């Protein structure tokens, strides 16, 4: 039936992908050995979407692991769920990308990608009906950005009408885990603004603030961040993977959420979020989840939606809910928050309600916003890039890899056009 291919970019892509498949394996009750222990038919009903049926009935998740630094993939195989993935779908060469977008994209990753595409074609040929592709990666990483970019390019060229989206880590506004990031971000964003259907911006600082504040934590790690992200992913794919009212296909979401082809960028969000023991003072109702979802503090992207206007909003729900509470809350919210929404698009909300809640919760929901604070992200990125590029810092590496300066110029031009287009509608 309807199927989605998940391509995990190197490093953070593979890690987040690991947690992603862990969550999905928990969702459908799939043992890490590939065995189905699930207690319901809805588990295996349409499960063919993310999984394939083996001869022994063991379920192989449909995914492709791509990294130039196998150490991560080695750690993945060393993981408990590493046995789910057949050794065939592991595709890696051995070199560092050195966080060089050009080196990864043009040279060493290009000697790889063909095999990845072969595997993609295999999976695609094994698809009854292909909805599209999804790419978990990171902006600022050489492999993630370069290889992810090359991959979405080739994949789109191979599958133009198919859905293509990516969950991409975006550079942090204050600190940075690497230098040269603005270059990779700019180039990747250029190729991403032209190539994909949609992309989800997520900054670690936002998740740090959220997890530290909302969930009241002490010493967790990236796993929890990836867990959250994968929870969001599971949410949208849950709307896809289970019955309910106003069931939302991915392209339907893409249709409702994107008025203008070139502005597809979104802000993911999730509810409910409560710390241990503080949950007892909270009640589970649609108003609560909506209050959490529309809270600027719960935005997983670094931004302040208070500055901007919503072009489109999609709130997906999970569990048993009354359509009324949703309707009333959306109406009241849109009513009192007026001027936070674009005036020439009446009814900016897209509602989808799944009857199947996530494990452990009576109800859950996720928030996909569209706003110009993304333009603000593009502003800071453009600024940093301009600062670094003006003095031609680190440029000799990319130039050494055969990357022409005109491409940087073009990328910046397109980014400026993009943010300008964000400012155009406001």
């Amino acid at each position: 039936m309807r199927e989605i291919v998940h391509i995990q970019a190197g490093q953070c892509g593979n890690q987040i992908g690991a947690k992603f498949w862990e969550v999905i394996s928990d969702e459908h009750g799939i043992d890490p050995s590939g065995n189905y222990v699930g207690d319901s038919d809805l588990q295996l009903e349409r499960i063919s979407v993310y999984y394939n049926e083996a001869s022994s009935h063991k379920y192989v998740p449909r995914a492709i692991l791509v990294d130039l630094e196998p150490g991560t993939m080695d750690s993945v195989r060393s993981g408990a769920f590493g046995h789910l993935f057949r050794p065939d779908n592991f595709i890696f060469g051995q070199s560092g990308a050195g966080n060089n977008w050009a080196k990864g994209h043009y040279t060493e990753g290009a000697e790889l990608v063909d095999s990845v595409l072969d595997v993609v074609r295999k999976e695609c040929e094994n698809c009854d009906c292909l909805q599209g592709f999804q790419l978990t990666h990171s902006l600022g990483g050489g492999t993630g950005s370069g290889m992810g970019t090359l991959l979405i390019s080739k994949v789109r060229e191979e599958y133009p009408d198919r859905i293509m989206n990516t969950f991409s880590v975006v550079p942090s506004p204050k600190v940075s885990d690497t230098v040269v990031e603005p270059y990779n971000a700019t180039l990747s964003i250029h190729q991403l603004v032209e190539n994909t259907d949609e992309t989800y911006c997520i900054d670690n600082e936002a998740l740090y603030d959220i997890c530290f504040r909302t969930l009241k934590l002490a010493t967790p790690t990236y796993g929890d961040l990836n867990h959250l992200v994968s929870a969001t992913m599971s949410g949208v794919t849950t709307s896809l993977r289970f019955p309910g009212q106003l069931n939302a296909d991915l392209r339907k979401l893409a249709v409702n959420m994107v008025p203008f082809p070139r502005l597809h960028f979104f802000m993911p969000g999730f509810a409910p979020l409560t710390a241990r023991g503080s949950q007892q003072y909270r009640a589970l109702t649609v108003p609560e989840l909506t209050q959490q979802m529309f809270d600027a503090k719960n935005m997983m992207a670094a931004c302040d939606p208070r500055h901007g206007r919503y072009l489109t909003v999609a709130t997906v729900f999970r569990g048993r809910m009354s359509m009324k509470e949703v309707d009333e809350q959306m109406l009241a919210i849109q009513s009192k928050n007026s001027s936070y929404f674009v005036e020439w698009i009446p009814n900016n909300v897209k509602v989808a309600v799944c009857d199947i809640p996530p494990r452990g919760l009576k109800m859950s929901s996720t928030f996909i916003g569209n706003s110009t604070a993304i333009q603000e992200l593009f502003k800071r990125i453009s600024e940093q890039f301009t600062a670094m590029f003006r003095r031609k810092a680190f440029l000799h590496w990319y130039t050494g890899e055969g990357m022409d300066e005109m491409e940087f110029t073009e990328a910046e031009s397109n980014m400026n056009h993009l943010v300008s287009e964000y400012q155009q509608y406001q």
Partner: protein, 430 residues
């Protein structure tokens, strides 16, 4: 003899269809396996096989398997013929283009042929029933296309449809106006009559009048099912006055370009209030003519009544009925268009509106269902056109439709037709 083929397109149509058919099963004493352990007016809506197995006459169509798979795994899987359940591999994505053109074209032929054989089995065919959401891509496009095809093929066969009218305040999608206007364009050019219902009004009604907690689509569909069942019940049982759908066409359509009868149903009350509430025909009619009890959010007092069709069930004597109608005639808060001497027609049915086990509606020995036209619906069309005018002025989301095979001229033409409809209501309102 007199038979009708039901049609359910989209989640709305299918679920409403489910409610409708379970209600039918309850009314005819049939059980999910297609058995019933005088009523041949059920043979009207049900065919039969050598084993005495009674199966419904309907066609379920969803471009995505989704709900229909729930139906296939549902209790009534033993009821419906496996061929009557038709599923594609993906939806219209709230895009009129797909459903009307890109997807449905590879499906609709099958659907049409199945409807044709289903029509071949009929001793006689009065018409069709099309259930869909208004503004939903699948329902909109596919029912537009299907209505065109059916209109071409079956000619003068009555075409009736129950559409869910988009609510003014609340919406499940941003693109609903486009699909809605394209729908009413291509549908108006074909459909004989269309019953408009707005979920918000149903919410207000059930909440306020039924005095219940915040409900879901279920009992909503049950109410719609009650209305539809009341109509078909006017057809499905021998009362004092029996009514053919052609008569609904005759009475509710003074002009070919205007058919949009608004549904209203009374009494609607809690089981507790039913004890204190005295049910009389006059009071029920008074409740029927109440603007708050209408199934659409349009206010009838902003326009005049053109045609009004009242369908009675259970215990009703035409004496106090005509008396009540006169009592209504005396009231000038309710005004009728000047050139219409009388817009009233009264159906009478002996069988009462049976209640569904686990249902929220109180049991009553009588009930009334109004089908009537007003220009307040033109006001609704106006607000719809306004929303569309905005979103179209900014050319939002158009690239989908365009890339998927729609032309801007179609949108323009549709809008022009809407303007024409507005002026039609305006001129007729004189």
């Amino acid at each position: 003899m007199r038979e009708c083929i039901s049609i359910h397109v989209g989640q709305a149509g299918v679920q409403i269809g489910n409610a409708c058919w379970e209600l039918y099963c309850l009314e005819h004493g049939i059980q999910p396996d297609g058995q019933m352990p005088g009523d041949d007016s059920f043979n009207t809506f049900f065919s039969e096989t050598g084993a005495g197995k009674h199966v419904p006459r309907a066609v379920f169509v969803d471009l995505e398997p989704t709900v229909i798979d729930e139906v296939r795994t549902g209790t009534y899987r033993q009821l419906f013929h496996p061929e009557q359940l038709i599923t594609g591999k993906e939806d219209a994505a709230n895009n009129y283009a797909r459903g009307h053109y890109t997807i449905g074209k590879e499906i609709i032929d099958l659907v049409l042929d199945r409807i044709r054989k289903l029509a071949d089995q009929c001793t006689g065919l009065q018409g069709f029933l099309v259930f869909h959401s208004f503004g939903g891509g699948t329902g909109s496009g596919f029912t537009s296309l299907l209505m065109e095809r059916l209109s071409v093929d079956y000619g003068k066969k009555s075409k009736l449809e129950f559409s869910i009218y988009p609510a003014p305040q609340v919406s499940t999608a941003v693109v609903e106006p486009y699909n809605s206007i394209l729908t009413t364009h291509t549908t108006l050019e074909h459909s004989d009559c269309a019953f408009m219902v707005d979920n918000e009004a149903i919410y207000d009604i059930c909440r306020r009048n039924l005095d219940i907690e915040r409900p879901t689509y279920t009992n909503l569909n049950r109410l719609i099912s009650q209305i539809v069942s009341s109509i078909t019940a006017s057809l499905r049982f021998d009362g004092a006055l029996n009514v053919d759908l052609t008569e609904f066409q005759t009475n509710l359509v003074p002009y070919p370009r205007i058919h949009f009868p608004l549904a209203t149903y009374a009494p609607v009350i809690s089981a507790e209030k039913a004890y204190h509430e005295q049910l009389s025909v006059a009071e029920i009619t008074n409740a029927c003519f109440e603007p708050a009890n209408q199934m659409v959010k349009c206010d009838p007092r902003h326009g005049k009544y053109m045609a009004c069709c009242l369908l009675y069930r259970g215990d009703v004597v035409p004496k106090d009925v005509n008396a009540a109608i006169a009592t209504i005639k005396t009231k000038r808060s309710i005004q009728f268009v000047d050139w219409c001497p009388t817009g009233f027609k009264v159906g009478i049915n002996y069988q009462p509106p049976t209640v569904v086990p686990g249902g929220d509606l109180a049991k009553v020995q009588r009930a009334v269902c109004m089908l009537s036209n007003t220009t307040a619906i033109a006001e609704a069309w106006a607000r719809l056109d306004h929303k569309f005018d905005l979103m179209y002025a900014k050319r939002a989301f158009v690239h989908w439709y365009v890339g998927e095979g729609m032309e801007e001229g179609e949108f323009s033409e549709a809008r022009e037709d809407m303007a024409a409809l507005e002026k039609d209501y305006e001129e007729v309102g004189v």
